[model samples]
Target: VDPRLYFENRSKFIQDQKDKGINPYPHKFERTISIPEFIEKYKDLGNGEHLEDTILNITGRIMRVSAQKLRFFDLVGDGEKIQVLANYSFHNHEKGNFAECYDKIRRGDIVGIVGFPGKSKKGELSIFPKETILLSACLHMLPMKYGLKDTEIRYRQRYLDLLINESSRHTFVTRTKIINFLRNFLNERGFFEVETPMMNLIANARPFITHHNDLDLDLYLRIATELPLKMLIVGGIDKVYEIGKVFRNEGIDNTHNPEFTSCEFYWAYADYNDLIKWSEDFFSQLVYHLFGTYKISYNKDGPENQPIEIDFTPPYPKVSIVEEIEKVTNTILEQPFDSNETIEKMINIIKEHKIELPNPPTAAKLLDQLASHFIENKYNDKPFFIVEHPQIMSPLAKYHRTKPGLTERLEMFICGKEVLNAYTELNDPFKQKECFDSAFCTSLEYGLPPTGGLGLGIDRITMFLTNKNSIKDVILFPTMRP
Candidate 1:
């Protein structure tokens, strides 16, 4: 005999049922109500009581065959569980033997039952069955009583994780709901959603990407939807947005993923100040909509790790990026930045503070490093908008009208990580040429209206809402290591 007898035995049972003219995998179950609804509907049933007048139809995955000799089982559907009582005397006219049928019934099988809803003799809400239907057969055992474990298998075989873990299903459900709410919010605000190219020909940086032999060209995966959506702003679409995928060949970490979803929008005649107000409203509304409150409890490490109450109410405080760094390091950053002179000064400041130098030591990277050490690392408890980045740091952002040598840009932060980035568009053609490549300068020549633009990571947003420990936990079928 084979060593793996029980696993094989379940598979053999499926064929045996098929030979008896039973379709183990059926097309439909015709379920009358879901498990949750059934529980809610007949919630008042007393002990040893049955609702026998109308037989209610139900279908779910058989999660357990507990007390099978006594014909009691447990089923789960839509993340809700209800016990099933399979006493054969309830339906005397059915063809199959209750003994042999219950014998073959196993955990992981999806079953349909026609039964009256009632409370068990011991008073738990349960289903009193008249007929049993095996809609789908599982040919192997589940992890037995305890749910699925092992982090590798949980990410790899997500279906099993979802089946055994109620919280996993809830996390994904919350993810979908959050996305839908975002789409609806944008739609209601009159922002026209549009699609752009994912496989781009003109990337800011040269890419290591897929090739097309037919065209003899290498197509780069888009690093951002910003360029195309901004081009749409130039093309006379006043308010346009794209919810799309971006790929980065970067470090794989708790927060980093090779591929992710980002939502970006451009609005004509709007400035960074307008976006600041909009950001406050959007985040406040989203938090309330998802959890029915302005406050959500999340563990920065994950659920139940180190719980902190996060207040997402409107009018979150703003921190000046340059000002924060100057205060933290006790050094004044040079205004109207002279390239090398300013770069060396920042490098000296970092060295004096015993902070690691930003690689290559460009003005933008230097400013970024300073902000991370001074501003982002300090704001961990709640949300803050890190505002007014230097001109060198925000090449696409319009120069600040009131403040010299700064751009009107803002990055929204929650739990010490940036959740949103927005800027007032720099419509000046020569400045665009000076900051970025000449391609966007060409678009600026076409006269893009004074526009405000925003970009937010959809995957990271879901991770925030779900309190997930890693980006991989939230993503289904995540890119994994061998």
Candidate 2:
């Protein structure tokens, strides 16, 4: 039917309902139990067993209206559907019969029912209602059915997507479960969840900036929750973590969202080594508990589904950052790269590779770019950690106790995508001052114990766990261009 004709018909029907002194939209309806609960409570009720005197009130959206002539319908709420039979004989109406008000009920309308539990002759558990009310009317038409081909429209109008798309609903449900599992996992391990500032003076990435009109101060939306989490550690919270939003002024891609969820934790009196062992245990247990297995596949429906068999068995292999890069690119850097000659040599090697980098790429950015191409690609199958980063790349991390120019840091990767980064935090106040901004370094002078900090990219983790190809799929509402 034409949309204009449908709207005209619905308008006339609504006016007809008003003319009959029927309330098309009521304020409230008493709902004693959900459709799911009702179904479960009477799942095994015999076909002939009718509770005619036992009255229960329920409410839901009308998914299907079988027949007004026979007064039958299907009502659904919270993902569960149940039959509703408004047989005229069952209802005690002071005003009129079920057929009199039946024209006002619709497939998309919110409805209320007072019914008795029983089984139909067809052996389906059903609700035989004595009272039916139009709780709310759906003014517009719903789609005939949801389709995956309308991915963009589905995301733009998520309410409709959730109403009709079971898969989309399931994905979000699983996301909630994943977050809850992580919270429980950490809480079980003596970790206290904490909230850190979302805006600050110290920058973690290219910070999202805004000017505070009242204070006349420039503030940044935090790029990471690390600094404040570390501050909590300094304040004597032994095991602390935060799961919250972090914004970065960066480009969006299949894996990157400007604003994303991240989990960061600091464990005092620990090092990166302990984090590696604990991390393997964390992922292993999470997979087993959630999936009941160590191995799983991603992109399972594509023509070439990528089977990612994760062996979360303890002691995932480790590779040194410097060593891995050197082995792959066949280039070497002296321990400190302190001398002008060593720096020039490194630059020459970068030029030889014809690498593209930020204009005037500093030594740190150069090394990071090199690792992205050479080191990270070396491991693609199972979980692996790249450890002992160059000092310049990890200034906030503690220097390797023995390796002069290295930092005790490790980054875990799954299928070449970085998921977790951890390090023995740098506590030397003087050195920290040089590395971080002045304000953060000033706070460090009060004394911070030896601490290990780990950051997990929650968005990427959701993608991997849900077998979703795009970060936007896992994010409830991804950033979009106008």
Candidate 3:
């Protein structure tokens, strides 16, 4: 059955209860103990102990129910899980409506369980249900056998997935850990985490455009927050970073989402050399703090003998973009190709050997064309960087100090796919304005300065961490067409 239908119908069931004076949706359903706290406090209170004398209260969805009046449910009170067993026939007499409420309350209902903590005959830790209050009734019928098996449905209805699938809930918790660790890392580095406007004035100056209705004026969602961040640097604020969302009107794939997060920071008096050193330190510490180890692994193509390994144990190999290409493919561009030149070569390569793009491509767009038409299945293992991009390729990056025509930028690749794109900010307002003016005129035909920026694919990072073979698995709601 369709998960959405199940969700809608389940909601109607709850409203049915409310209309019948069940008052399922109440002001507050208080619980004296959370799942994690119970586990911590009574971990030693095991079998044959007088744990029955100790009372505790717990709450979460009714995860599952077993036959013969023996109930096995997962209590998810506070971002953690605890297994609870209830011999409903033995003790729910005082609360006669317990079984009746349980009948109405399906697998997805929210409820609070109050009773003594003790092990059942089957050795499962549980509350000998003295009372069960229906906090929120479920009208929806959850997947009984396997609990959220559809990959597409999980991300589309993440809340349901969280209720049914333990792993889904755990992954999101780890995601929160990653964010918290990043916050502390930046704070310790003397970088102030700040916010920037999501709406902007430059539509033609970017690769995409969006709208706003508050002022009844067309507004652009920022593709990167680099411009204003640099302005803060110019205004004498030395360090700042904004962890926020940016929008791009582009093709959706496993790794690319129209709207996702990017963390961009600007430090006055910091240069490309310093950025290289700091970038390594920042991510290395971040991984360790979050997962307690730097060795990261993922099944790039899933366990079908396509697993990939990553070494985040510091000193991430840094190589020039052109130089790395020359070494691996023995290919060299006499000079960076123009739009026409790149397209022809890319198409020929695709025709000669059919291949998929590592990501979706834009119409007749050089970067997208190259990424989609070429290099998808082209590289050997090992995370490397295509550093020092061409000026024509990147619009807002700082120029190389010694290497002419190449910018001081780096594109991180893992298992042949680009994941992280970082750059030294083009601090010189004059140079930044020039690039912006050129890009805007070339596309929008209206000349305005471009925003200086760097961005990473958040979806791709999550994919690498989770070992997801497709980008869709990591993203909550990947764009889909009917």
Candidate 4:
């Protein structure tokens, strides 16, 4: 229908109702009960039972009309729906034409009904009206059932999509439930939740800059919460966790967004090995709570989707990054390496195998890209950890106790995507500052504790748990180009 005609008709109807002294937009309507409460209160009413003397007031939008003359309609509120019978003879309209008022009602209109409890001949609990009021008018028609098939409109106009699409709403509801359960799990483990600055200088990603006018300084939105949370560990606070949004000026992809949610925790007196065990138990808890099984099916519609039950059983496979890269890519390396020479060798190897590299590739980016193709992709069937990263790859992590040029760090991959990153934090002030800059070593002479830190991508977790493909699908309102 043309929007212009719809508006004109709505205006004329509002005028006609006001000519009869009815308000199309009232200040408020106080309802005795919501539709869900009403349904639950009288669910046991017998077939054809009628409590004609009991009056109750309810308000909702007209969801469906069963008769052509609007004699019966389904009123919906808070995701609960109930049938309403417009028996004109029963309504006490001493001063107006109730039938004429009913004629102006439409499916999307916000309406209020004063009614008695009753059961229809079809055995559905329903309302028998005593008075009907138009609380608000809906000027435009509602969408057809599951009408948000176009992805662009669905993202750009999420309000309409959420109103009409159950699946979209279900995804977000589950998102909330997931976060709630995760918080409970952490709190029970003696982890203290803390808030950290959203803007900081030390988070490990491409900086997203904004001007702080009053301070007359440029600030960067934090890409990760690792530094501050670990600093708390240095200040004698142990077992701290933060769940918040972080920002990075980065590319948009199926798994990445400029702004995203992450949960990072720091534990004093813990190691990467201990964190690996805790991670398994954490995932187990989530699976048993949300799915009631150790096995789950993710990406059910994708070509490489898992079997009927993909097991999330703990003690997942672990391989050192060097070992795995060698096993899959047929490469070997000698220790005490040269960064420039190693990167050049790796780049030549990538070209030899006809692999693609992002433009202006550096050592860290090349190593990460190689792992994606050679290590991560090979372990798509289940969760696995790539452990003991090269020393050059992890500046904040402790040096491996026995290995010469590796760090005690681990990253878990599932669905061929990185979900969790952790490391036994370097606490030796000299070593830590050396990791940063030797010039800063003198300021960090104070002793620090042995600590472990973990960073998990909440968005990717939701994506897999909800079987959504894109980061935007998991986020309620993802950033979009204006």
Which candidate number would show the highest TM-score if scored against the true structure? 1
| Alpha-carbon lDDT, every model | 0.82, 0.80, 0.63, 0.80
Clashing pairs in 3: 10-139, 10-140, 254-471, 321-387, 436-450
Residue 268 local lDDT, model 4? 86
Clashes of each: 0, 0, 5, 0
What's the TM-score of each model vs. the native?
0.93, 0.88, 0.79, 0.90
| 1 or 3, greater by TM-score | 1
Looking at model 1, report the run of 10 residues with the lowest lDDT sum.
142-151
Worst 10 residues of 2 by lDDT: 300-309
The list of candidate 4 runs beyond 4 A from truth reads: 68-70, 201-204, 300-309, 337-345, 433-444
lDDT string for model 1 (1-482, tens) is: 55379768877877877897888888987889998898789878789788789888898888877663368888888888888887766864556677776677888888888888888899888888877878888876665315455447777778888888888899999988888988888889899999987776766343549887899998888888887788889988898998877888776787777788889989999999899998998888998998999898778865557688888877888899988888878877777554667777889888988999877877778888888887896765668899998887787889999999898999998887788999999888777746443466677788889999999878888888888768887888897776
Candidate 2, residues 1-482, lDDT tens digits: the string is: 78778778888877888897877778778789888899889999887578888899999888776663466677878877888876777876775676766656777888888889998878777888877887887767777564544458666767776777666777787788778888998899999998887888767357789998999999999888888888888789999999999999988898888899999989999998899988898888877777889876776334266465556666788989877777766767776654566566666767788877545667776677777877776766578899999887887889999988899999999777899999999998878647445656666888899999999988888777777778888888776764
Evaluated at residue 465, the lDDT of candidate 2 is: 76
Model 1 alpha-carbon drift over 4 Å, by segment = 1-4, 144-150, 204-208, 302-304, 336-340, 434-440
Which residue segments of model 3 deviate by more than 4 Å? 1-22, 68-76, 79-105, 144-147, 204-216, 303-306, 327-381, 428-454, 477-482
> Compared with the true structure, what per-residue lDDT tens digits does model 4 show for residues 405-424?
89999998877888999999
| lDDT of each residue in 88-170, candidate 3, tens digit only | 65456665654565566566668887777765555555666667777876665665425456445666667776666666666
Q: Could you give the C-alpha RMSD of every candidate to the true structure, in order shown? A: 2.4, 3.2, 5.6, 2.9
